[PDB]
Design a binder for this molecule. Sequence first.
Ligand SMILES: [C]C1=C([C])[C]=C2C(=[C]1)N([C][C]([O])[C]([O])[C]([O])[C]OP([O])(=O)OP([O])(=O)O[C][C]1O[C](N3[C]=NC4=C3N=[C]N=C4[N])[C]([O])[C]1[O])C1=NC(=O)[N]C(=O)C1=N2[C]([C][C]=O)C1=[C][C]=[C][C]=[C]1
Lengths: 666, 133
Amino acid sequence: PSGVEGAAFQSRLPHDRMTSQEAACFPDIISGPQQTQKVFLFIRNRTLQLWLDNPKIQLTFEATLQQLEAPYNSDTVLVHRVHSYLERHGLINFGIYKRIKPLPTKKTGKVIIIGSGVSGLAAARQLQSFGMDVTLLEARDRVGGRVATFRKGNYVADLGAMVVTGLGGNPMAVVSKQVNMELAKIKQKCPLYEANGQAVPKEKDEMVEQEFNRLLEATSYLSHQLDFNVLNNKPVSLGQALEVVIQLQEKHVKDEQIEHWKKIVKTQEELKELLNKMVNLKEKIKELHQQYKEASEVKPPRDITAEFLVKSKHRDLTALCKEYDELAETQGKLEEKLQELEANPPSDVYLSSRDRQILDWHFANLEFANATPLSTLSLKHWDQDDDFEFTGSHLTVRNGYSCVPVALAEGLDIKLNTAVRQVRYTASGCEVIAVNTRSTSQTFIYKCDAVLCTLPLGVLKQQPPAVQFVPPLPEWKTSAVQRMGFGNLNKVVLCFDRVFWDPSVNLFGHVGSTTASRGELFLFWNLYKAPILLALVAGEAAGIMENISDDVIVGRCLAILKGIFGSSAVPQPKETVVSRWRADPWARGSYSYVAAGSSGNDYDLMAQPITPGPSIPGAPQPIPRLFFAGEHTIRNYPATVHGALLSGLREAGRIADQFLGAMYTL
Amino acid sequence: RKPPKGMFLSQEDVEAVSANATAATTVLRQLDMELVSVKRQIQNIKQTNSALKEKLDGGIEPYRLPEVIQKCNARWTTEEQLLAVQAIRKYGRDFQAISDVIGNKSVVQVKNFFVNYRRRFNIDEVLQEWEAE
Ligand SMILES: [C]C1=C([C])[C]=C2C(=[C]1)N([C][C]([O])[C]([O])[C]([O])[C]OP([O])(=O)OP([O])(=O)O[C][C]1O[C](N3[C]=NC4=C3N=[C]N=C4[N])[C]([O])[C]1[O])C1=NC(=O)[N]C(=O)C1=N2[C]([C][C]=O)C1=[C][C]=[C][C]=[C]1
């Protein structure tokens, strides 16, 4: 879409309806008359447009009203309310803008933010921007967390997030106009290459993929229609369902062969019975001809009974020749009706061994998308975030994604090498205790009104804890942390002195030999200006590969590549790197998924803040003190940069509302 | 509402391939055997039928009686009336057979015959003796 309705869409909002969040701060308007609602919506959209059209410079209340018309610039408490909401919740003026009104001189309130991932950074920026005292505590010696970027000479490749997944409604779209990331589109086309080292040919390539697709829908039908979601108490996984479907596909193939031969026999046996009749007639005939012959040989003159005998037997014989002629008739029909059936058999197999193997690559691809074994994904929910995909072609951040965390970090109080060990929070505030990662006996204490926790779910998951909560997190939250899934996926970075692959091809698959290893180096990316190839490790394979030496990995890696391109077009690599996200103690994995037995709803639990008990008993109910952002906290955009970025904006909003108070709600 | 095209999936069938740990591979074996045990039954009866055909070799060619082409006359020669009376004794009411035997009387002349000579060839008796067989 476009106009002002484009802005609504490009901001993830329905252009012609008020959202639940708007109903919350404008209950006057939404419970009001339809006429006022349209004015509101218009104002909203028009403001958005304005910001969007030009997100390199702040958009002030003035500059806004400045650009409106009657009947809209009519009411200015309204205009001011609207602008102020949009600002608070980071719909407008988020990211890196040029400020018009240099920063309000003294600050109010103090917030500790754990971790300077994008979620953390994005939140900090907002809070500082709202004039609050912000400090971030990073365990690593750099910003950006799971946005990591390998750099050396002219070599530049991300070991973490790497793709912008469409600009159509993507906060990141805005960010890229504020920050020169080099966005290059990805051509979808992915030639697969069997174990041997040769292309799967268009014929097959297409049949398998297409079967894969049908197999998926199948699970979906299985879930929603047949309601196959519990199986002896345990939630059914996607993996399970996929088998149960393949099983049934195999079955019906057999079922079909069975009733096809079942049809042959019933017919090839009507035929027997007819041939039996036919012999026995040829029998009576043989003997009747004899009888007639012997009656003809009585030379005449004969008396009439002997004349009748000749005649009788003659008719009697033509009668039985009529029959054995109609039966030879019938016989001919049933005999062709049987080269018929026997010439067009049903199919021999559901899928061959070469097939099942290629289908496995498609499964690996999916295990990659979800950073996890399909046997862990939830059936009912694995794709719950499906509706909220952006539109537009996927892109690569050609100059390395790190360029974004770094841009965001600028201006901010970030203590690097500072490992939080304890969060304690009480009716009157919070202290956070961290240490120095370099000499770990050397201790730090941070006092604050609020703590925003952006620790990766993998971290939050650790047994036993890497971070202590004082007091312990309420069980409703810890169950959420258990129930949810936190998967893994790894990269191999291959740096060469020359291109030896197809320059115009962005990705190309390698087909493994087994189910057990579909994930292993199953896919390669040609993305960058420099001659670099990237290789994925997904599925069950990812976890196991982390215990293998780098050399051995680059081994199997070159192996495959020679296999596909020629054992002497493939040199030694000038520089190599291998990720190990499950090992990395400040990640403990790669991103989250909807595990079997979870749902999108757990994600909402993750985001719900924590309010301490009262100090003196019978003292009033306190303010909430402990807040959460992170890719694991945003139901509609899990596992992504934009999704984290968004959770950051979210929390900053909710924190300011609480601590600086909301002037706009009236 | 319905499965994808050419994917097959009965409620009943699902409950079948799940009801225990190996109900999966159990059931694809009952079919793998039910199949081979028919492919065999086929050959058994293809063999039976192949031999029963080698008996029918030669057709009925050495037994076939040349074409008789003769003009349906209307006179009852004494010879013909006699053929008649005996064809009745042997064939009953089958007027076609009688007509065939006599050679040159159509299926109706035959019926008419039954009525004219009814008195004098005791066709009552003759018919009632044909029944007693
Ligand atoms: C791993 C990964 C890879 C390899 C790739 C990718 C990814 C991943 N994705 C995702 C993203 O990246 C994420 O989500 C984000 O980044 C997240 O963020 P946050 O939430 O912020 O978190 P972080 O970053 O982790 O941060 C945090 C922080 O904190 C700290 N700590 C810890 N602990 C502690 C601390 N501190 C203190 N103390 C203590 N104790 C740490 O260190 C940190 O810093 C993605 N996304 C997007 O968007 N894109 C892309 O591309 C990506 N990638 C993906 C996957 C998916 O599926 C892809 C690939 C290819 C294609 C497509 C996609």
